Amino acid sequence: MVSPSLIAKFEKTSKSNIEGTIKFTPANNGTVSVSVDLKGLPSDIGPFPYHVHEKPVPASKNCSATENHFNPYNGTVRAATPAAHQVGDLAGKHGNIMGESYKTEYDDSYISLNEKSRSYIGGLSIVIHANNGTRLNCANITLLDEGHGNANTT
């Protein structure tokens, strides 16, 4: 069995010009490949922490309603090795988003695409913050492909 790929789609509105995607695809050796492709960032208030948060973005697009970080193993915001960070603290482990546009690829060995895992991130959300913590934009983590099953194509 292999678990399905996920995506978070950020859209531009009157609240934020940030738009683009963060894709999560199963990779080699027990890791998930993360692909960040964002533009429209308000650079001078960055760099921009971003994290997996615990609740969905509601229809209102209120990023506060995503509540706190996904942290099933009670990690710490400051850490000296990647595994000591919260599972959801992508920026702490891999770097803050920065610039007006940001494109990067990396592996994360703590998030999970397997819905039976305590580290599963499906159905959660991602929030992008200004450096001072203000929530700028957010997106739900949803399935990437439309068609699944061992007898299907997409």
Question: Where is the binding site, in residues?
Answer: 51, 53, 69, 129
Closer by beta carbon to Cu ion, 97 or else 127 = 127
Encoded tokens for 5: 């790929």
Nearest approach in angstroms of CB 145 to Cu ion is 26
Q: Strands of 19-26's sheet, edge to edge?
A: 50-53, 125-129, 135-143, 6-10, 19-26, 32-39, 102-108
Residue recorded with tokens 């194509």:
153
Which residue has the CB atom at the shortest distance from Cu ion? 51
Structure tokens at 97: 């988003």
Q: Which of 8, 22, 32, 51 binds Cu ion (CB under 5 A)?
A: 51
Q: Which of 127, 136, 139, 141 binds Cu ion (CB under 5 A)?
A: 127
Contacts of 58 (CB under 8 A, 6+ apart): 65
Site string for Cu ion, 80-119 (x = CB under 5 A): ----------------------------------------
